[PDB]
Scaffold this active site. Structure first.
Site, PDB file in Angstrom:
ATOM      1  N   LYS A 181      -2.050  11.415   5.938  1.00 14.11           N
ATOM      2  CA  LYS A 181      -2.780  10.179   5.668  1.00 14.11           C
ATOM      3  C   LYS A 181      -3.747   9.955   6.816  1.00 14.11           C
ATOM      4  O   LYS A 181      -3.325   9.707   7.951  1.00 14.11           O
ATOM      5  CB  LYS A 181      -1.828   8.994   5.524  1.00 14.11           C
ATOM      6  CG  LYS A 181      -2.592   7.709   5.191  1.00 14.11           C
ATOM      7  CD  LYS A 181      -1.690   6.612   4.679  1.00 14.11           C
ATOM      8  CE  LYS A 181      -0.812   6.057   5.764  1.00 14.11           C
ATOM      9  NZ  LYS A 181      -0.232   4.729   5.383  1.00 14.11           N
TER      10      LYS A 181
ATOM     11  N   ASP B 221       7.269  -4.007   0.291  1.00 13.90           N
ATOM     12  CA  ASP B 221       6.598  -3.571  -0.942  1.00 13.90           C
ATOM     13  C   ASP B 221       7.435  -2.574  -1.700  1.00 13.90           C
ATOM     14  O   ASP B 221       6.919  -1.602  -2.246  1.00 13.90           O
ATOM     15  CB  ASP B 221       5.186  -3.051  -0.644  1.00 13.90           C
ATOM     16  CG  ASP B 221       4.236  -3.162  -1.831  1.00 13.90           C
ATOM     17  OD1 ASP B 221       4.600  -3.742  -2.899  1.00 13.90           O
ATOM     18  OD2 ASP B 221       3.096  -2.649  -1.687  1.00 13.90           O
TER      19      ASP B 221
ATOM     20  N   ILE C 142      -5.436  13.357  -2.518  1.00 13.27           N
ATOM     21  CA  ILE C 142      -4.520  12.773  -3.495  1.00 13.27           C
ATOM     22  C   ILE C 142      -4.941  11.357  -3.889  1.00 13.27           C
ATOM     23  O   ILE C 142      -4.949  11.035  -5.070  1.00 13.27           O
ATOM     24  CB  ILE C 142      -3.080  12.784  -2.924  1.00 13.27           C
ATOM     25  CG1 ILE C 142      -2.654  14.220  -2.531  1.00 13.27           C
ATOM     26  CG2 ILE C 142      -2.099  12.177  -3.923  1.00 13.27           C
ATOM     27  CD1 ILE C 142      -2.722  15.255  -3.614  1.00 13.27           C
TER      28      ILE C 142
ATOM     29  N   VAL D  11      -4.919   9.864   1.583  1.00 15.25           N
ATOM     30  CA  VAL D  11      -3.815  10.856   1.620  1.00 15.25           C
ATOM     31  C   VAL D  11      -4.276  12.174   1.045  1.00 15.25           C
ATOM     32  O   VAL D  11      -4.903  12.221  -0.020  1.00 15.25           O
ATOM     33  CB  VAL D  11      -2.586  10.361   0.843  1.00 15.25           C
ATOM     34  CG1 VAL D  11      -1.448  11.409   0.826  1.00 15.25           C
ATOM     35  CG2 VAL D  11      -2.069   9.106   1.475  1.00 15.25           C
TER      36      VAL D  11
ATOM     37  N   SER E   1      -1.715   3.203   2.078  1.00 18.50           N
ATOM     38  CA  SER E   1      -1.674   1.807   2.508  1.00 18.50           C
ATOM     39  C   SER E   1      -2.804   1.453   3.470  1.00 18.50           C
ATOM     40  O   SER E   1      -3.219   0.292   3.522  1.00 18.50           O
ATOM     41  CB  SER E   1      -0.329   1.461   3.121  1.00 18.50           C
ATOM     42  OG  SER E   1      -0.086   2.228   4.268  1.00 18.50           O
ATOM     43  N   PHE E   2      -3.284   2.428   4.241  1.00 17.51           N
ATOM     44  CA  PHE E   2      -4.634   2.416   4.820  1.00 17.51           C
ATOM     45  C   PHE E   2      -5.114   3.831   4.618  1.00 17.51           C
ATOM     46  O   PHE E   2      -4.344   4.671   4.272  1.00 17.51           O
ATOM     47  CB  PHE E   2      -4.739   2.025   6.333  1.00 17.51           C
ATOM     48  CG  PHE E   2      -3.977   2.939   7.284  1.00 17.51           C
ATOM     49  CD1 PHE E   2      -4.533   4.139   7.737  1.00 17.51           C
ATOM     50  CD2 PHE E   2      -2.727   2.579   7.759  1.00 17.51           C
ATOM     51  CE1 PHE E   2      -3.835   4.982   8.604  1.00 17.51           C
ATOM     52  CE2 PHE E   2      -2.024   3.416   8.619  1.00 17.51           C
ATOM     53  CZ  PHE E   2      -2.575   4.624   9.032  1.00 17.51           C
ATOM     54  N   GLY E   3      -6.379   4.100   4.857  1.00 22.10           N
ATOM     55  CA  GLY E   3      -6.859   5.491   4.806  1.00 22.10           C
ATOM     56  C   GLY E   3      -6.623   6.270   3.508  1.00 22.10           C
ATOM     57  O   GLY E   3      -6.447   5.695   2.453  1.00 22.10           O
TER      58      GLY E   3
ATOM     59  N   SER F  48      -5.905   6.976  -2.106  1.00 27.37           N
ATOM     60  CA  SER F  48      -5.791   6.022  -0.992  1.00 27.37           C
ATOM     61  C   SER F  48      -4.330   5.701  -0.672  1.00 27.37           C
ATOM     62  O   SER F  48      -3.489   5.595  -1.567  1.00 27.37           O
ATOM     63  CB  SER F  48      -6.535   4.698  -1.272  1.00 27.37           C
ATOM     64  OG  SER F  48      -7.940   4.892  -1.326  1.00 27.37           O
TER      65      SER F  48
HETATM   66  C1  LIG Z   1       9.383   3.223   6.633  1.00 26.22           C
HETATM   67  C2  LIG Z   1       8.588   2.585   5.484  1.00 26.22           C
HETATM   68  C3  LIG Z   1       8.838   1.063   5.505  1.00 26.22           C
HETATM   69  C4  LIG Z   1       9.156   3.077   4.215  1.00 26.22           C
HETATM   70  N1  LIG Z   1       9.590   3.393   3.221  1.00 26.22           N
HETATM   71  C5  LIG Z   1       7.085   2.927   5.561  1.00 26.22           C
HETATM   72  C6  LIG Z   1       6.216   2.112   6.281  1.00 26.22           C
HETATM   73  C7  LIG Z   1       4.856   2.358   6.293  1.00 26.22           C
HETATM   74  C8  LIG Z   1       4.335   3.449   5.621  1.00 26.22           C
HETATM   75  C9  LIG Z   1       5.184   4.319   4.946  1.00 26.22           C
HETATM   76  C10 LIG Z   1       4.679   5.547   4.244  1.00 26.22           C
HETATM   77  O1  LIG Z   1       5.350   6.072   3.375  1.00 26.22           O
HETATM   78  N2  LIG Z   1       3.660   6.209   4.816  1.00 26.22           N
HETATM   79  C11 LIG Z   1       2.948   7.381   4.447  1.00 26.22           C
HETATM   80  C12 LIG Z   1       2.358   8.106   5.473  1.00 26.22           C
HETATM   81  C13 LIG Z   1       1.721   9.291   5.188  1.00 26.22           C
HETATM   82  C14 LIG Z   1       1.664   9.720   3.886  1.00 26.22           C
HETATM   83  F1  LIG Z   1       1.032  10.881   3.626  1.00 26.22           F
HETATM   84  C15 LIG Z   1       2.176   9.000   2.809  1.00 26.22           C
HETATM   85  C16 LIG Z   1       2.043   9.462   1.398  1.00 26.22           C
HETATM   86  O2  LIG Z   1       1.352   8.830   0.569  1.00 26.22           O
HETATM   87  C17 LIG Z   1       2.813  10.629   1.038  1.00 26.22           C
HETATM   88  C18 LIG Z   1       3.720  11.289   1.836  1.00 26.22           C
HETATM   89  N3  LIG Z   1       4.238  12.365   1.166  1.00 26.22           N
HETATM   90  C19 LIG Z   1       3.700  12.407  -0.093  1.00 26.22           C
HETATM   91  N4  LIG Z   1       4.002  13.305  -1.043  1.00 26.22           N
HETATM   92  C20 LIG Z   1       3.361  13.143  -2.203  1.00 26.22           C
HETATM   93  C21 LIG Z   1       2.452  12.123  -2.435  1.00 26.22           C
HETATM   94 CL1  LIG Z   1       1.686  11.986  -3.994  1.00 26.22          CL
HETATM   95  C22 LIG Z   1       2.147  11.201  -1.450  1.00 26.22           C
HETATM   96  C23 LIG Z   1       2.798  11.342  -0.222  1.00 26.22           C
HETATM   97  C24 LIG Z   1       2.811   7.805   3.126  1.00 26.22           C
HETATM   98  F2  LIG Z   1       3.202   6.986   2.127  1.00 26.22           F
HETATM   99  C25 LIG Z   1       6.550   4.044   4.912  1.00 26.22           C
END
Ligand SMILES: CC(C)(C#N)c1cccc(C(=O)Nc2ccc(F)c(C(=O)c3c[nH]c4ncc(Cl)cc34)c2F)c1
Ligand SMILES: CC(C)(C#N)c1cccc(C(=O)Nc2ccc(F)c(C(=O)c3c[nH]c4ncc(Cl)cc34)c2F)c1
Ligand SMILES: [Br-]
Ligand SMILES: [Br-]
Ligand SMILES: [Br-]
Lengths: 262, 274
Positions: free
Chosen positions: A36, A129, A16, A24, A20-22, A18
């Site tokens: 991720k 953020d 999909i 997805v 916040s690290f790595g 990048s």
């Molecule tokens: C609790 C808090 C502070 C909030 N609020 C927080 C802190 C740190 C990280 C995240 C955080 O959300 N992590 C994270 C981890 C794994 C993922 F795959 C994804 C991720 O892009 C997606 C997870 N489903 C998804 N469906 C569709 C699409 Cl297009 C993308 C994704 C992701 F964003 C949230």
């Protein structure tokens, strides 16, 4: 209990973007998931700490308006597994598709976002953020707050409180800066626009927002924006951090004003 | 970690009371459901029931399983979960004449299978899967729960069970009906119940619609002489579902398929329909 997912169980699908690290991916694990993954031979101590922090925060959350954490893996790579969100971000709907929501729906999106944020702050979690690209409209109706980074879409200047954008000190973030970002989301919902849409230079926005000489143009709000929502937005956007309301008050106000329409 | 301090939840409308306690709609960072298990000081039974239910629920994080959110212990033992908005599959099919398109019937089966695959992966036997425990939330996401879990549980394997569990007889595997082991429930009895849900989805009817009393069903399902009339599936029932339903309903529990296989089959069908 334990959330570690054994190696081999997840089928990692389409890339999909990048995070916040790595990176997805969409995956399969008892249904759809997002995975991720940090695609490196060996993680740095910094990467390990970032992973641990993220799992630590996410495992503290169980709320319908927060992205559902489902598990993690550490071998052969660091991975964070969550629900898959179906649809598009609020940014995509408002600014890219320019989806025309009815006022009732716009207020419900504000209400659901406030519930998620109220929850995070109650759990002692600062988002840092919040922005419409981080508000997923799952199944076009249920808000899921995440930190999706690039997977959904500097990219955050427009949502930064004056104390954050000024780079006042080495960590200027607080619940009140989350409140300001939520005020900008209210702006987006109620105007259908990003703030500063006619300012063409980012450095100018940084300087003037930080100084208090530029702020969002509240004349852009739609004619049926409820007065109480306009006033609430203005309170969330107060230039002085300590004058902004807390999420329990924000949420209560939105719940009240939502009742009044319906 | 999941204990909610007293005072934070505004307990609203009473939704229902029964052997499960009392469920209320509440406010706590948005909508919640709150199930209260006692009013006076809890018995050791009530306390252990509470602890067990929190223990099971806290093992679950999946879109198709009712989201556990927290608990309280004073002044009442309370289990807090998401609020589900809409109706159960049972209410839709059997109380409301809802007419779902086949793509939607199969999506309901698919999401139910995902949730059940998940539970079984976590080593959780549901024990009471049935269409009234399949909630069609916002009419788009299935949430599996156990919305009638009795707190007081009989020690006696026998015939007064079937009165209290009268709401579940149609979904009970033959070996569950017979009670020839002290705990006859298994992953495979959950699969059998899912077979009956498939029957409901593909026929639009309850099984045994012409059998006029529960005692006859208990006797004949237990003896092997009564089986759902599979021929009553609607004309648009996919061939894959006829086979799958028959496999889930197999009389010998070890001949029923596992949820990973069930899920994979339904995912393939859903692709074929899409
Ligand atoms: C609790 C808090 C502070 C909030 N609020 C927080 C802190 C740190 C990280 C995240 C955080 O959300 N992590 C994270 C981890 C794994 C993922 F795959 C994804 C991720 O892009 C997606 C997870 N489903 C998804 N469906 C569709 C699409 Cl297009 C993308 C994704 C992701 F964003 C949230
Ligand atoms: C994991 C498993 C094996 C499954 N599956 C399982 C085992 C034991 C118990 C439960 C179980 O689901 N508990 C439970 C706890 C608290 C509740 F409020 C309710 C409850 O009636 C509701 C929870 N939201 C609701 N919205 C609306 C309405 Cl009308 C009712 C409710 C509830 F059913 C689930
Ligand atoms: Br947890
Ligand atoms: Br009867
Ligand atoms: Br009956």
């Amino acid at each position: 209990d334990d959330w570690e997912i054994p190696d081999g169980q997840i089928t990692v699908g389409q890339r999909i973007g990048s995070g916040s690290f790595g990176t997805v991916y969409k995956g399969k694990w008892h249904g759809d998931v997002a995975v991720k993954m940090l695609n490196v031979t060996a993680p740095t101590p910094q990467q390990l700490q970032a992973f641990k922090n993220e799992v630590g925060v996410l495992r503290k959350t169980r709320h319908v308006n927060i992205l559902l954490f489902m598990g993690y893996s550490t071998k052969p790579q660091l991975a964070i597994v969550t629900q898959w969100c179906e649809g598009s971000s609020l940014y995509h709907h408002l600014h890219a598709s320019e989806t025309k929501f009815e006022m009732k729906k716009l207020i419900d999106i504000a209400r659901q976002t406030a519930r998620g944020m109220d929850y995070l702050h109650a759990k002692s979690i600062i988002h840092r953020d919040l922005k419409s690209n981080n508000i997923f409209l799952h199944e076009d109706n249920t808000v899921k707050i995440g930190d999706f980074g690039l997977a959904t879409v500097s990219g955050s200047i427009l949502w930064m409180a004056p104390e954050v954008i000024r780079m006042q000190d080495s960590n200027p973030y607080s619940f009140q800066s989350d409140v300001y970002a939520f005020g900008i989301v209210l702006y987006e919902l109620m105007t259908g626009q990003l703030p500063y849409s006619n300012i063409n230079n980012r450095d100018q926005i940084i300087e003037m927002v930080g100084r208090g000489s530029l702020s969002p143009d509240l004349s852009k709000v739609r004619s049926n924006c409820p007065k109480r929502m306009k006033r609430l937005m203005a309170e969330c956007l107060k230039k002085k951090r300590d004058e902004r309301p807390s999420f329990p008050r924000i949420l209560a106000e939105i719940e009240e004003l939502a009742r009044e329409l319906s």
